[PDB]
């Protein structure tokens, strides 16, 4: 799937207020760069798709179905947590609570701006292909 | 000469100098082989006068449009509007209360999916244009 | 308790609820704007109050079981979207 | 008509009822046909050669 | 290219569209035009 690596942060705090103490690994995010000198050496090693850039519109649709099957797995991911973050297993985490809550209650919704905005811009952005 | 006669009376609001059009070039009406134009052409003089006057005025009352329809008749005239609403002359309504007579109200088509669908016909209809004259000329 | 669908309320349904007056809604939800609870708006053109809740809680398990079937309504649909997408351009995914 | 259809005669006054159409419209809601629309031409951009 | 079917088959430059939309409306635009104010 798509899962890169990882990294952790040195922390020492007690846990959050009202627990015991604790260490509380926490998360840094992560990345792979990639610096000159190092890419022809990585070029010439692939040598079997090499998926050129920007891409003859079969790229961009197949970027947006594992862009979006990254997705649902994060969501089926989450299904799995939620069925077992009560379902009785462990101490849930009062950080955690609130962490999932402002966003299913800050995700925006459809108006009437939003309508006649829409159709405003993709007639634009249309008839110029058009 | 005969058509460019025909259509100046059509267009006009006159009936007399039609007839006499009518009178006179319906030899050449017969030899050219059509017969329709005697009963299709009184729907179209009676219909141009209603139709220029929804396209001008935008509020006209019925007692208005009879005297400027040569009509001397205040009854029918909420009866030539139903068939011209039915017909498809014009888009109004009448307000059977006193004798209102409305027309169009918004003019936005804009950002109302007016525009993609039109443009839908143009893509697919142009790509058709441009594959079959693909196809036609690498013959060798 | 309305899960952002309606959230345009009226002065009238905070005026049963917190059992005040008309004329101290307003200055009530001045308060609550300046604390920062939440940054939502206020109209008078309609007397609706319109809010934006930006600061969440804790809630019990019972709150949690329409939220986990929020979730998993929203987790259908973008799976069956996504089948729509990949059987509609599947000959030109390659 | 009194007895087929409505136009019944009250108080010197009929009564007919309204036959128009109430739709509440939002026109966003057939955004699939547009991807489909989308795609379809991307489609026949490419594919043959 | 003639296509096996006849049955039987100056003055101004270009002046329809005037003609089409004004033919006859009194053109010397004078005697009702310019005497409104009598009848007013």
Known sequence: LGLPTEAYISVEEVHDDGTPTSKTFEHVTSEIGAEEAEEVGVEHLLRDIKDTTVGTLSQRITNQVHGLKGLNSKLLDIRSYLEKVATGKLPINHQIIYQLQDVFNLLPDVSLQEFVKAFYLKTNDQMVVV | MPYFLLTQAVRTGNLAKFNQVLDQFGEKFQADGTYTLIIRLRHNVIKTGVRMISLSYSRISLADIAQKLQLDSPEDAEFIVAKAIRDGVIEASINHEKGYVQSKEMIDIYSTREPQLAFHQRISFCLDIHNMSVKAMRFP | ?94 | YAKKRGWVLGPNNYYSFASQQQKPEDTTIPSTELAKQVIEYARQLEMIV | MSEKKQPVDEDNWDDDNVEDDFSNQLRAELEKHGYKMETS
């Open chain 3, 1 to 94: 308790t309305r899960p952002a669908n309606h959230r345009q309320l009226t002065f009238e349904e905070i005026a049963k609820s917190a059992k005040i007056t008309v004329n101290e809604v307003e200055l009530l939800v001045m308060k609550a704007l300046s604390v920062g609870l939440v940054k939502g708006s206020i109209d008078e053109v309609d007397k609706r109050v319109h809010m934006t809740w930006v600061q969440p809680r804790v809630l019990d398990l019972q709150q949690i079981k329409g939220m986990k079937d929020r979730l998993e309504f929203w987790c259908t649909d973008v799976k069956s979207m996504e089948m729509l997408v990949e059987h509609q351009a599947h000959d030109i995914l390659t």
